């Protein structure tokens, strides 16, 4: 059975449901790799 209610508010119900430091994961010879920092 398929829902045709088109009541996708559920998505909004999660849209409504929802400082930056990264971490060095490897380093050497003047190069580093940094996990995290999503908005660099």
């Amino acid at each position: 059975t398929i829902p045709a209610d088109d009541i996708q508010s559920a998505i909004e119900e999660y849209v409504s449901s929802f400082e930056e430091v990264g971490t060095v994961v490897d380093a050497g010879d003047g190069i580093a790799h940094v996990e995290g920092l999503p908005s660099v």
Binding site: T1, I2, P3, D5, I7, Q8, A10, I11, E13, Y14, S17
Partner: protein
């Protein structure tokens, strides 16, 4: 569960992840067996397919369910009510499969 884990580790594997695929495949088989003994032997099939065709239309829900970093509890929260909506999901085993 520990017995099936034992008989699972009892064989060699191509890689690391394939074992996780095998175990969750076993979970799938068990949920389907529960459904088959419940008399829903094929209702689960059409339920899965219709939900798949529903999810196919919406790329938003589809892709953001593939959040490779959000906590798995966050993922199941995402699924909860968009699945638990109405008669469109009357099957009581498909909930655990999709979860």
């Amino acid at each position: 569960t520990l017995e099936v884990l034992r008989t699972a580790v009892s064989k060699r594997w191509s890689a690391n992840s394939d074992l996780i695929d095998a175990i969750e495949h076993v979970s799938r088989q068990a949920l389907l067996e529960l459904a088959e003994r419940a008399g829903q032997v094929d209702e689960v099939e059409d339920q899965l397919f219709r939900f798949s065709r529903i999810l196919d239309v919406q790329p938003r829900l589809a892709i953001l369910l593939g959040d490779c970093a959000v906590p798995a509890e966050g993922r199941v929260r995402l699924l909860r009510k968009v699945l638990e909506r109405a008669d469109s999901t009357v099957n009581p085993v498909v909930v655990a499969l999709l979860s």
